[PDB]
Amino acid sequence: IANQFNSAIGKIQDSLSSTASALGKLQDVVNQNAQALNTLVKQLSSNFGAISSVLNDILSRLDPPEAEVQIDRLITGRLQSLQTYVTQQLIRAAEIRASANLAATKMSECVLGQSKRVDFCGKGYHLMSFPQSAPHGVVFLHVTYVPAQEKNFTTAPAICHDGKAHFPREGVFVSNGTHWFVTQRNFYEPQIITTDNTFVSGNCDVVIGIVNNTVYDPLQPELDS
Amino acid sequence: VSMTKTSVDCTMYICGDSTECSNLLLQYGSFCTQLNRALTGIAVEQDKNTQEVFAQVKQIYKTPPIKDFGGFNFSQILPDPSKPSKRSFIEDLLFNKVTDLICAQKFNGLTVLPPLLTDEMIAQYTSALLAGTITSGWTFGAGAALQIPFAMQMAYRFNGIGVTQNVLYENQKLIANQFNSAIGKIQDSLSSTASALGKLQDVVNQNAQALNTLVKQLSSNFGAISSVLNDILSRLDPPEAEVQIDRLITGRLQSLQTYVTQQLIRAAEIRASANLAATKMSECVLGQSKRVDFCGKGYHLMSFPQSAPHGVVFLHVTY
Amino acid sequence: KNKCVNFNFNGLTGTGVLTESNKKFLPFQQFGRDIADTTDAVRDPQTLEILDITPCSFGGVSVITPGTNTSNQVAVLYQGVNCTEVNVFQTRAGCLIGAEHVNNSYECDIPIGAGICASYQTSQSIIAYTMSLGAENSVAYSNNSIAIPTNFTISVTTEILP
């Protein structure tokens, strides 16, 4: 676990160093603001139907009563430009506040504690998350437990010994074709079938597919010894 | 999930087939060029909602030729190859119960862009996710696919809700009649009752009233003598027509911006439900969550996703 | 007829394609109107007939090209219209000129529409293909069969939020 994990950090460093587009989500924030600001600035150069876009030019040419007509066009148009900018910024404000709340949620579930949610902290069984600061945002490094290799085994729903069906207390029943073992679902760790690893429920005439075997009772040899 | 994609052209819409009228649009700057990017961004977001929800995996999982479910009948939710388009029996009713109109608006300058993800490929998403959950249980999305007997899959699902797995093996015979009968009631409710799909119908009608009203603005004079550009151009002088054209463009700009503003607001509401649809896929469908009444009333066990036009339908199994 | 023209009929000036219409307008009826109150059809004052008005200038223009450092090859895509002006192919999105059609399915690179995507590949040129949904994985299923992982790996996922 120390070799796989430590080797993973090296892959994150190489990935982040080589790939500059992984942060594009943050670059889009800077680009969006740059485009919105650049646009808002370039609208001042437009005449908005007026003879000229410069106010002093209108005042230095048209008479007082005539200049008001042209200035009204500039104001009316420039006011609408702010309405478009403010409106757009309020929309983007709803998009960033949604992501910010999501980040705060992940820090609570993924970072501070351990979350059992499915694919919320990333693929696999969530172990823990380490936050990292990024410009106008945050980065989350999610350590997870992903099973690698798998092998196919024979299973049975229950074991029949004394006439009463035996069920696993934890794990599942597995066999290679000879003896029946009880093991966890996340890994293969052979364990003998015992009264301590199973419990008695129902009978052997109910469970469909029940198999016969001998359930090892630790108390038998203790009484013999 | 997905909202109808509509791309409006402020160059053709504002001034129809008019060179002089269009000349006045340049004086307004990016107002036309700006509104084009606002609508384009909404069309791009429509494709990201279907990719982050419909398909949660990079592989396709198909059912085996010999299907043994342990006494349960999945034929209703399983895809039928006999049909020309592969879909589940439940998805067939959704397509019919959810409804030229576009020809009239398409010629006005409003173009409806087709979705990057066809409804045919969307149906195969639910077929892979629904097929992986049955054969692979809940472990197909968390890593390599685990082959597990479906009879033993529900045994643990009862353990997470506080019920010993011993009740499933013994009572699994009676669960076949309760589970199969529950699926049949859904098919009869959607076919007989058409009001259950009103949630998605309100989304289509929301855009319909916005498109038809936007086209009706051209008939309004907006303070101008007439609402037709050729009528004012052939009557009033170029300088006088510009005064009337100013009221036409100014009136149409306020109507065009009002439509774009509503689309951005409606798009935000759709994205809010998109995250929920993507959240229900992993927690309800893909995995199992101890949270109560998120997947529907009762202890959650398994969820079966179903494709629907401009949306998605979820079938949740509760205890 | 069957061509885009600029027509003046009974004082009504407009541009559109003139075609014979199957609609029968009453004698007192001169020009028809659609839901949008645009002219639906026209009637020639000389020889009385009903002509369907189909507007002109349909479809968009889009450019499909790889990065500049890749190559200067371009593929013109006309969306919402078939092939008119004019490697000339047609899709549900519209006429696509400048891109070859490869029946083999690959991973979507440059999205087009209707499940079709484009990429620059092998003497290399822009090719069009159906979006691949991923490799088919058939999980063997049997009542007595189970799969227990024999190995594990620790993975680190990088997620970013603004």
The CA R_g of chain A, rounded to the nearest whole Å, is 35
In this structure, are residues B35 and B249 in contact, taking their beta carbons and an 8 Å threshold?
no
**Cα gap A105→A120, rounded to integer Å:** 10
How far is CA B178 from each of CA B135, B183, B317, rounded to the nearest angstrom?
Answer: 21, 9, 11
Residue B58 contacts C where some CB pair is shorter than 8 Å: yes
Distance from CA of B162 to the nearest CA of C (A): 24
CB B152 to CB A87 under 8 A? no
Q: At B313, phi and psi to the nearest 5?
A: -120, 135
Distance from CA of A117 to the nearest CA of C (A): 16
Distance from CA of A150 to the nearest CA of B (A): 8
| Phi-psi map region of B310: left, alpha, beta (phi>0 left; psi -120 to 50 alpha) | left
* Pairing assessment for the beta strands A159-160 and A211-212 based on DSSP bridges: parallel
Hey, which chains touch B, using 3+ CB pairs under 8 Å? A, C
Q: Using CB atoms, pick whichever of B29, B155, B286 lies closest to residue A43.
A: B29
* Pairing assessment for the beta strands C100-101 and C125-130 based on DSSP bridges: parallel
Residue A16 contacts C where some CB pair is shorter than 8 Å: yes
**Cα gap B194→B208, rounded to integer Å:** 20
In this structure, are residues B155 and B284 in contact, taking their beta carbons and an 8 Å threshold?
no
DSSP E strand boundaries for chain B: 7-8, 60-61, 110-111, 300-308, 311-318
Quick one: angle between helices A64-106 and B238-280, nearest 10? 10
In this structure, are residues B285 and B277 in contact, taking their beta carbons and an 8 Å threshold?
no
For C75, residues 6+ apart whose C-beta sits below 8 A from its C-beta are C63, C64, C65, C87, C96, C97, C98, C99, C118, C126
Q: Using CB atoms, pick whichever of B70, B111, B114 lies closest to residue C113.
A: B114
**Cα gap A157→B133, rounded to integer Å:** 20
Looking up tokens 């993924």, which residue turns up?
Answer: A110
Closest chain A CA to residue C140: A152
**Cα gap B134→B139, rounded to integer Å:** 10
Residue C14 contacts B where some CB pair is shorter than 8 Å: yes
Query: Which residues numbered 136-165 in B keep a CB inside 8 Å of some CB on C?
Result: 136, 140, 143-152
Residue A117 contacts B where some CB pair is shorter than 8 Å: yes
Please give the resolution of this entry in Å, rounded to 1 decimal: 3.9
AA letter at A12:
I
**Cα gap B138→A185, rounded to integer Å:** 12
In this structure, are residues C49 and C84 in contact, taking their beta carbons and an 8 Å threshold?
no
CB C156 to CB A5 under 8 A? yes
CB A183 to CB C148 under 8 A? yes
- Helix (H, G, I), strand (E, B), or coil: what is residue C156? strand
**Cα gap B126→B280, rounded to integer Å:** 13
Residue A135 contacts B where some CB pair is shorter than 8 Å: no
State both tokens at A38: 């650049």
What one-character DSSP code corresponds to residue C4? Answer: E
For B208, residues 6+ apart whose C-beta sits below 8 A from its C-beta are B101
Distance from CA of A106 to the nearest CA of C (A): 10
Q: At B105, phi and psi to the nearest 5?
A: -80, -30
Query: Strands of C88-90's sheet, edge to edge?
Result: C62-64, C75-79, C94-97, C88-90
CB C149 to CB B59 under 8 A? no
**Cα gap C80→C58, rounded to integer Å:** 7
State both tokens at B225: 């003598």
- Helix (H, G, I), strand (E, B), or coil: what is residue A79? helix
Quick one: angle between helices B198-216 and B238-280, nearest 10? 170
Give chain B positions within 8 Å (CB) of A208: 151, 169, 172
CB C156 to CB A209 under 8 A? no
**Cα gap C118→B266, rounded to integer Å:** 31
For A143, residues 6+ apart whose C-beta sits below 8 A from its C-beta are A5, A8, A126, A127, A128, A129, A130, C154, C155, C156
CB B146 to CB C140 under 8 A? no
Closest chain C CA to residue A3: C154
Task: Write out the DSSP string of A2-42.
Answer: HHHHHHHHHHHHHHHHH-SGGGHHHHHHHHHHHHHHHHHHH
